[PDB]
Design an enzyme around this catalytic site. Structure first.
Site, PDB file in Angstrom:
ATOM      1  N   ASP A   1       0.826  -1.199   0.000  1.00 55.07           N
ATOM      2  CA  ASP A   1       0.000   0.000   0.000  1.00 55.07           C
ATOM      3  C   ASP A   1       0.866   1.257   0.000  1.00 55.07           C
ATOM      4  O   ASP A   1       2.051   1.224   0.340  1.00 55.07           O
ATOM      5  CB  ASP A   1      -0.935   0.013   1.213  1.00 55.07           C
ATOM      6  CG  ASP A   1      -0.198   0.279   2.513  1.00 55.07           C
ATOM      7  OD1 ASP A   1       0.730  -0.491   2.842  1.00 55.07           O
ATOM      8  OD2 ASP A   1      -0.542   1.262   3.204  1.00 55.07           O
TER       9      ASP A   1
ATOM     10  N   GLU B   1      -0.783  -0.630  -4.733  1.00 58.38           N
ATOM     11  CA  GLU B   1      -1.705   0.495  -4.889  1.00 58.38           C
ATOM     12  C   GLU B   1      -0.903   1.787  -4.951  1.00 58.38           C
ATOM     13  O   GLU B   1      -0.131   2.082  -4.031  1.00 58.38           O
ATOM     14  CB  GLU B   1      -2.714   0.570  -3.746  1.00 58.38           C
ATOM     15  CG  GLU B   1      -3.530   1.854  -3.785  1.00 58.38           C
ATOM     16  CD  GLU B   1      -2.967   2.932  -2.875  1.00 58.38           C
ATOM     17  OE1 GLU B   1      -2.791   2.670  -1.667  1.00 58.38           O
ATOM     18  OE2 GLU B   1      -2.669   4.037  -3.380  1.00 58.38           O
TER      19      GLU B   1
END
Lengths: 606, 606
Positions: free
Chosen positions: B304, B342
């Site tokens: 992330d 991401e």
């Protein structure tokens, strides 16, 4: 031009493993292209309904490497064709060696088998199978093969076989109930004599007409994959069929044959020296893996290739390099294919990689095991005492190759007797003997292969003119053998202790009970254990202590003698508490009662 | 000698990717080895019950590369331990950075966390899964991720989550029933603050105590694999927890954080960010990635806030090179793992191979798609006319990377509202829209991720302190949505037309019915094709014609408006025969009835 200039060079090289793209018959919407390998031909012509069967209508033109090419407008899919090759003074009609389907004009194959122009368009629905397929990595997975001759398996009506399409659903349903992972098909390549079982092949690139179209065969393969079943094809590079219209003296001279008289079955061997012969054969191997999504190829009678008399000596190098380059090429183009070889000599490293001087096959049939095992079990139980070493010594040779246990069609035919027929005693004992054999075969290291009808304990030998005796599935003993084989396969597919056939996967428990004919051994992977206790005598044994490494409760995972298999029902409770003192040099021991002619398979708990 | 001289050199190069073999606590049969990295420490000592917590009892010895190691007889698994590091005048107690298990003496993680010696012996039963894990090839396979917070899923009692073991069978049964292929677990690495959801990490090598032991987690991962479920773990290389005994100023200096003061403050992560310049930091992180795939068999790791690594505000080359070699080592050692990123910028080649100048991830979250889609359907159907371009232009960006269409926990928090809450109208229409959203997301190119609780359309934002509103599964509207997702995943798992997310896998049928807010597109692999017709308005449409490539009988494979999903029951009813009339520039066309706020998926008939 039909042939790229790079092509011809690859054909001279012996590296054209795509050759089916250009040789044979390839239709357009306006005509068909024809390409033939005929180096000693002075002329070649295609004859067919599309041109008055006139030899001068379409004379193919000679290119490089003995390759001939020509286009015929109006030659369409579904016509028959024929090559008229002229060798100087003499002229002869021949079939296409690259024929993609052959079909008898008469209706009877032994009379005539002509080439038909075909389009091979087919759409597959087996993506999931082909994306998860695992060839060489299968050494660490359960491989259980059901060997089948399609015409003999089931008959739609007496003396008429099931079609490829019609066979798909019955075969898949039955194989799934059995728990088999793959189907091995006796040679599908076009052959005149049905009694050959396919081993005398005329059309290497054509699936046999008797069961349907080429695409019908792909539908069958497609279907089997969606059902999660593998398809291994029997392949015959050992020799070609003795049919005059076929490959024999294609140009009027030796072509697929040895040029030299002295060497060369006789005569009808492939000359592996010739670059064209190696091309034709190796392309055909990939052709089956490519256009038909075949999962594996099984080569029979490798010894006939390896030696010449089955300072140059007995060994034939030509064949060994071809066999080596064959296997190398397969795994380069299809990393998840499988190659199996049957070699009745003790040629080393059949299952070894070429870079280690091996032949490059992934698997070898353990026919030694088959012979020893069979020789042992025909003997009457009174006598098995006197031949105990035949059983135990099977493991001294069990790790020399990656092996498949080989119960095969050849074993049940020509007077050898059904596997059922082979076993001694009354009917209860024969079913018991057959259940014991399968139990031991699944316990023994190596992959398992069983030919049609062995799963029933069928009475009669395999007859290609009929279907197996499915009526015996009604009498109790025979559904029991089937229940036993299924349960074995379910155990095989699930317990990873049976997946690893290396020496690591086996430990001896006891092999010295010659008088009682009892064998105890272990099959292990990591923590997981499977204990095998085997009684090759009817006499039930009580308080038979068997040493085990781990203590605690043990479970009885399979009992050959359970009534569901047709047995006496003599069995351990299925809860067995290990005794904390020694047996067979082991810390604990299990005290069991051994049922008659039965195999116990036992596992510790959690 | 605990450390090989090869061990010291590899650590110095920052190439020690097995560093967990030697750093941390490793139990011996009579004692424990301890090894800690503290380059700027003058003294390092191990404290524990095994020496009455005396700092001079066991003073580690300095090896090269700033690594300290020592042996303690009597230190055993389950002992709590502590490092006492002396930085000149000052001394401080620290936890083990390589602690493989942590527990709070207080029983509150926030009040304290302790390093406990653990042995990781665990016997796995996931053979079949890991021999068949497809990893990179999964791009051509169906991937449906169920995103999960283990503590939040279900509570065994009010306010009490399930253990790693206890969750296994209930969750696996649920994930299997709904047909998802993998579960993504929000970070399980030891974290003080439960409300952090795990993204503030203290113990990178220790699964959180909240649900049990390391082996407890191993049972779950093992269990899910046996059930055919893949496990993706969320991994946080961007930052470590701001926790005083943790990695902050470990040796008494900046160590895991950037030495430079200007570098040390980063706007998203403040003072704590990993100094990717340091080879030791590079070891710790990349060893940790491999550690999870090695000892816990995890199938994937998802990173992330990649943008926070890439930029400092601009490019951080330290982070970019670390990211690249992270991905390279992962796929080198575990070729069938999966790495996902991401990134909130439009950074190119996130999903691209490093050798093509990509970051080397396999998958990227399509957050563009998520925002776009959510922005559009958040709006009222009367207005959807004016935002048609937001819906259709999503596919101009769908093939820029390998994409996973993701709706996540971050979307259903912080006043953003549930997915259900996000959708317009009353409950019937809200449920209809949610069926549409899932309908299009499964149709849109890319893999699929849905966060827990979205599958029934739960009302309230995801609250980590509670369990999901499963009681809504009693009410029809939500039980219908869950059924719709199940059917969607079944279609996805079985139809290969949905597996290929390349531009070849998608064809537009029509996009310019902006007025009525309808879109038709095709998902095609090879011959196979699936037709998606979408009505984003509550008025059903009758005699709506849709062009088709192939003419013949077509069947309706899925209807969002089916009564089973909570709908009108409006539909074509199957037996749709393409009309040999040209429409939408296509040879044939289908005359369809479009149900309210509904998705149709249609297949030609074979």
């Amino acid at each position: 031009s039909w042939l790229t200039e790079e092509d011809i060079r690859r054909w001279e090289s012996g590296t054209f493993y795509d050759s089916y793209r250009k040789l044979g018959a390839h239709p357009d919407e306006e005509g068909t292209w024809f390409c033939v390998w005929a180096p000693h031909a002075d002329a070649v012509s295609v004859l067919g309904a599309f041109n008055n069967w006139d030899p001068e209508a379409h004379q193919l033109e000679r290119y490089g490497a003995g390759l001939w090419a020509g286009y015929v407008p109006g030659a369409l899919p579904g016509h028959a064709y024929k090559y008229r090759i002229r060798h100087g003074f003499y002229q002869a009609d021949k079939t296409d060696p690259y024929a993609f389907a052959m079909e008898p004009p008469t209706g009877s194959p032994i009379e005539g088998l002509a080439s038909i122009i075909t389009r091979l368009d087919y759409t597959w629905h087996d993506d999931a199978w082909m994306q998860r397929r695992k060839g060489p990595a299968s050494l660490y997975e359960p491989v259980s093969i059901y060997e089948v001759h399609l015409g003999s398996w089931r008959h739609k009506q007496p003396g008429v076989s099931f079609s490829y399409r019609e066979i798909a659903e019955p075969l898949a349903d039955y194989v799934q109930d059995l728990g088999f992972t793959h189907v091995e098909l006796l040679p599908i390549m076009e052959h005149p004599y049905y009694g050959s079982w396919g081993y005398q092949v005329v059309g290497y690139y054509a699936p046999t007409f008797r069961y349907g179209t080429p695409q019908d065969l792909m539908y069958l393969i497609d279907y089997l994959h969606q059902r999660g079943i593998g398809v291994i094809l029997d392949w015959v590079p050992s020799h070609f069929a003795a049919d005059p219209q076929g490959l024999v003296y294609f140009d009027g001279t030796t072509l697929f044959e040895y040029d030299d008289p002295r060497m060369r079955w006789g005569t009808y061997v492939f000359d592996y020296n010739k670059p064209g012969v190696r091309n034709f054969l190796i392309s055909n191997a990939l052709f089956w893996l490519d256009y038909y999504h075949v999962d594996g190829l099984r080569v029979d009678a490798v010894a006939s290739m390896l030696y010449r008399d089955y300072f140059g000596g007995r060994e034939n190098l030509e064949a060994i390099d071809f066999i080596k380059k064959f296997n190398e090429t397969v795994y380069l183009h299809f990393p998840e294919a499988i190659t199996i070889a049957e070699e009745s000599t003790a040629w080393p490293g059949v299952s070894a990689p070429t870079y280690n001087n091996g032949l490059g096959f992934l698997y070898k049939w353990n026919m030694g095991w088959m012979h020893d095992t069979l020789d042992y079990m025909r003997r009457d139980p009174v006598h098995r005492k006197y031949h105990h070493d035949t059983l135990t010594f099977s493991l001294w040779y069990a790790f020399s190759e990656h092996y498949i246990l080989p119960l095969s069609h050849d074993e049940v035919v020509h007077g050898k007797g059904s596997l059922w027929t082979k076993m001694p005693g009354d009917d209860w004992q024969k079913a018991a003997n057959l259940r014991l054999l399968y139990g031991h075969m699944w316990g023994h290291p190596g992959k398992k292969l069983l030919f049609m009808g062995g799963e029933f304990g069928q009475h009669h030998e395999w007859n290609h003119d009929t279907q197996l005796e499915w009526h015996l599935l009604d009498q109790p003993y025979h559904r029991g053998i089937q229940a036993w084989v299924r349960d074995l396969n379910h155990l095989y597919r699930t317990h990873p202790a049976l997946w690893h056939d290396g020496p690591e996967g086996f430990e001896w428990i006891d092999f010295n009970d010659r008088d009682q004919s009892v064998i105890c051994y272990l099959r292990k992977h990591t923590d997981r254990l499977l204990l095998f206790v085997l009684n090759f005598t009817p006499v039930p044994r009580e308080h038979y202590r068997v040493g085990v490494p781990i203590g605690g409760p043990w479970r009885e995972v399979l009992n050959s003698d359970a009534v569901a298999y047709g047995g006496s029902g003599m069995g351990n409770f299925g809860r067995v508490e290990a005794v904390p003192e020694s047996w067979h040099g082991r810390p604990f021991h299990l005290e069991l009662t051994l049922p008659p002619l039965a195999i116990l398979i036992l596992e510790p708990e959690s």
